[PDB]
Design an enzyme around this catalytic site. Structure first.
Site, PDB file in Angstrom:
ATOM      1  N   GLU A 185       0.871  -1.199   0.000  1.00 27.93           N
ATOM      2  CA  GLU A 185       0.000   0.000   0.000  1.00 27.93           C
ATOM      3  C   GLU A 185       0.898   1.237   0.000  1.00 27.93           C
ATOM      4  O   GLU A 185       1.347   1.586   1.085  1.00 27.93           O
ATOM      5  CB  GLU A 185      -0.934  -0.055   1.204  1.00 27.93           C
ATOM      6  CG  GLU A 185      -2.074  -1.049   1.042  1.00 27.93           C
ATOM      7  CD  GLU A 185      -2.988  -1.186   2.248  1.00 27.93           C
ATOM      8  OE1 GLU A 185      -2.639  -0.643   3.315  1.00 27.93           O
ATOM      9  OE2 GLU A 185      -4.040  -1.842   2.125  1.00 27.93           O
ATOM     10  N   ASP A 187      10.215  21.854  -9.473  1.00 26.84           N
ATOM     11  CA  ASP A 187       8.797  21.555  -9.172  1.00 26.84           C
ATOM     12  C   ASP A 187       8.430  22.339  -7.923  1.00 26.84           C
ATOM     13  O   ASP A 187       9.338  22.602  -7.160  1.00 26.84           O
ATOM     14  CB  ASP A 187       8.541  20.062  -9.020  1.00 26.84           C
ATOM     15  CG  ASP A 187       9.459  19.379  -8.047  1.00 26.84           C
ATOM     16  OD1 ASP A 187      10.574  19.012  -8.465  1.00 26.84           O
ATOM     17  OD2 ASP A 187       9.040  19.227  -6.898  1.00 26.84           O
ATOM     18  N   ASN A 201      -1.032  34.126  -0.833  1.00 26.06           N
ATOM     19  CA  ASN A 201      -1.255  35.262   0.032  1.00 26.06           C
ATOM     20  C   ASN A 201      -2.632  35.046   0.593  1.00 26.06           C
ATOM     21  O   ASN A 201      -3.613  35.461   0.006  1.00 26.06           O
ATOM     22  CB  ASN A 201      -1.160  36.558  -0.743  1.00 26.06           C
ATOM     23  CG  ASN A 201      -1.439  37.774   0.115  1.00 26.06           C
ATOM     24  OD1 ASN A 201      -1.775  38.838  -0.399  1.00 26.06           O
ATOM     25  ND2 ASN A 201      -1.298  37.626   1.426  1.00 26.06           N
TER      26      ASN A 201
END
Lengths: 130, 130, 130, 130, 130, 130, 130, 130, 130
Positions: C35, C53, C60
């Site tokens: 899993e 990335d 904000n």
């Protein structure tokens, strides 16, 4: 005999790999069940330099929500006022006499066999080879 | 006999790997069940230099939410006012006489066998080879 | 006899690996259940220099939430006012007569066998080889 | 006899590995169950120099939350006002007559066998070899 | 007889490893259950020099929260006002007649066997070898 | 004998791979069931440099929602006021005497076999080869 | 004998791959059932440089919704006021005496076999070859 | 013997692949059932540079909806006020004595076999070859 | 013997592939049932540079809907006020004593076989070949 001789050159200044920053693997699998779903971007193959992607470039949001101020007898079992969320809301709320998940059953995964293989994961530079 | 001789060159200034910063592996698997889902980006193959990706480049958010101020008898079992969250909200709330998860069953994973393999994970530079 | 002789060169100034900063492994596995889900970025293969990335480049945010000020009899079992969170909210709240997780069952993982292997994880530079 | 002679060169100035800063291993495994999920970044393979990644580059947040000031009879069992958190909130709150986790069952992991192996984890430079 | 002679060179100025700062190992395992989840970054393979990563580059936060000032009869069992935290909040609060964790069961891990192995973890430089 | 000799050149200045930043693999699989659906972008193959994609370039949203202020006897089991969310809302709310997911059945995954393979994952530069 | 000699050139300045940033694989599969549907973009093959795509370029939305203020006896089991969401709303609400998902049946996945394969995933530059 | 000699040129300045940013694969499959439907764009093959596509270029929406304020006895089981959503609303609401999904039947996927294959996925530059 | 010699040229300045950004595959399939319908654009083949497509270029919408304010005894099982949505609304509402989906039947997918194949997926530049 795969080859009598290599005799590649009479002169050479180098042979081999400089600055190898690559990542190699054999990620093959042998299984009975796979669940890879529930994503926001998936299985996208982008060839070429200077690729770019944005989930949401800009969002100027103002937001009001009310799930309260309820004077009633019973308010229950409810997902409410969810917002501005990038991802998955799964099995968020449950109301029950009994809740279960993934019961594995009686004799439900027995005697299953795998016989899977690969020979090599090899990045190389050789004058002659087999 | 794979080869009588290599005889690659009469002169050479180098043979081999300089500055090898690569990461190699054999991440192959043999199993019965895999669950890799519930993600916000997944299985995206981006070839090329200067790649870029953003989940949310900019968000100028103002936000008000109310799940309270409730004068009622019973408010219960509820996910509320969730917001601005990048990821997964799973099994967030449960209300029950009994709650269970993943019961493993009776004789439910018995006598299962694996016989899986690889020969090598090799990055190399050789004048001649097999 | 794999080879009578190597006879690679009449002159050479070096043979081998300089500045090897690589990380090698054989991370193969043999199992019945895996899993690896519930992530915010996953299985993304980015080839090329100067990759970048961002989960959220800029936010904000101004934020108000109220899950209180409740004058009612019973407010219970509730996830509320969750916000600005990057990751997973799992099994966050439970209300029950009994709560259980992963009961392992009766005779539920018995007599299972593995026979999995690899030959080598080798990064090398050799004039001739097998 | 793998080889009669190496006879690599008539002259050489070096053979071997200088400045080897690499980290090698054989991290292969043989098991019945693996749980590696619930992460904020995972299984991302980034080849190339000058790679960069940010979870949140910038967040100028102002924040107000209230889970209190409740004059009601009973407020209970609730996760509230969670915020600005990068990671996993798991099994955060439980209210029950009984709570249990991972009961291991009756005869539930018995007589399971492993027979898994590798031959070598070797980084080397050799003139001739097998 | 693997080889009659090495006869590598008629002249040489060095053979071997200078400045070896590498870390080698055989971290292979044989088990029945592994739990490595609940992380904020995981299994990310970054090849290449000058790699960089940030969990949160900058956060200019102002923050107000109130879980108190409650004049009501009973406020109990609640996680509240959690914030600005990078990591995992697990099993944070429990309210019960009985709480248990990981009961190990009756005859639940008996007679399980392992027979797993490796031959060598070797980094070397040799003129000829087997 | 695959070849008598290579005899590639009388002069050469280099042979091999410089700056290899590629990511190679053998991600083939053998299984009975796969579920990869429920995404917001999927299986999109974009060849060419300077590719770009946006989920939502700009959204100037103002928003009001009310799921509360309900003075009625019973409001229950309801997902409400969901908004501005990029991703999947799955199994969001359940109200039942009993809830179950993925029961694994009686003898429902027994004696299934896999025998799947590959020969190599190899990126290389060689003067002559087989 | 595939070839007597290569004899490619009398002079050469290089042979091999520079700056290889490509991502190669063998993602072939052998299974009984696949579910890859429920997406917002899918299986779109875009050849050519400077490709671009937007889900929603711009949305200047003002929005009001009310699922509350209900003074009636019972309002239940309802998805309401969903909006501005890019993705999939699946199995959002369920109200039942019993809820089940994917029961796996009696002897419903037994004795199924796979025997699927590939020979190689290879990107290479060689003077002569087979 | 596929060829006596290559004899390609008397002079050459390079042979091979520079800047290879391509993504290669063998994504062939062998199965009994596939479900890839329910999308907003699908199977669109766009050849040529500077391709562009928009789901909705611009939407200046003002919106009011009311699913509440209902003073009636029972309002139940209803999807309402859904709007401005790009994607799939599937199995959104269910009200039943019993709900089930995908029951797997009795002996319903037994003894099915696959024997599917490929020889290679290879991108290469070679002076002569077979 | 496919050819005695290549003898392509007496002079050459290059041979091979520069800047290969292409994406190659063998996506052939062998199955019994495929469902790829329910889309908003599909199977559109657009050859030529500077292609463009829009689902809705501009929509200046003002909108009012009311599914509430109902003082009647029972309003139930109804999809209402759906609007401004680009995608598929499938199985949106169900009201029943029992609901089922995809029951898999008795012995309904047994002994089905596949024997499907391909030889290669190869993009290459070679002076002579077979």
């Amino acid at each position: 005999k795969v080859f009598e001789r290599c005799e590649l050159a009479r002169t050479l200044k180098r042979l081999g790999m400089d600055g190898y920053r690559g990542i190699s693997l054999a990620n093959w699998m042998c299984l009975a069940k796979w669940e890879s779903g529930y994503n926001t971007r998936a299985t996208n193959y982008n060839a070429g330099d200077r690729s770019t992607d944005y989930g949401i470039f800009q969002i100027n949001s103002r937001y009001w929500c009310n799930d309260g101020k309820t004077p009633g007898a019973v308010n229950a079992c409810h997902l409410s006022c969810s917002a501005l969320l990038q991802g998955n809301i799964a099995d968020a709320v449950a109301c029950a006499k009994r809740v279960v998940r993934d019961p594995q059953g009686i004799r439900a995964w027995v005697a299953w066999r795998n016989r899977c293989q690969n020979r090599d994961v090899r990045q190389y530079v050789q004058g002659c080879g087999v």
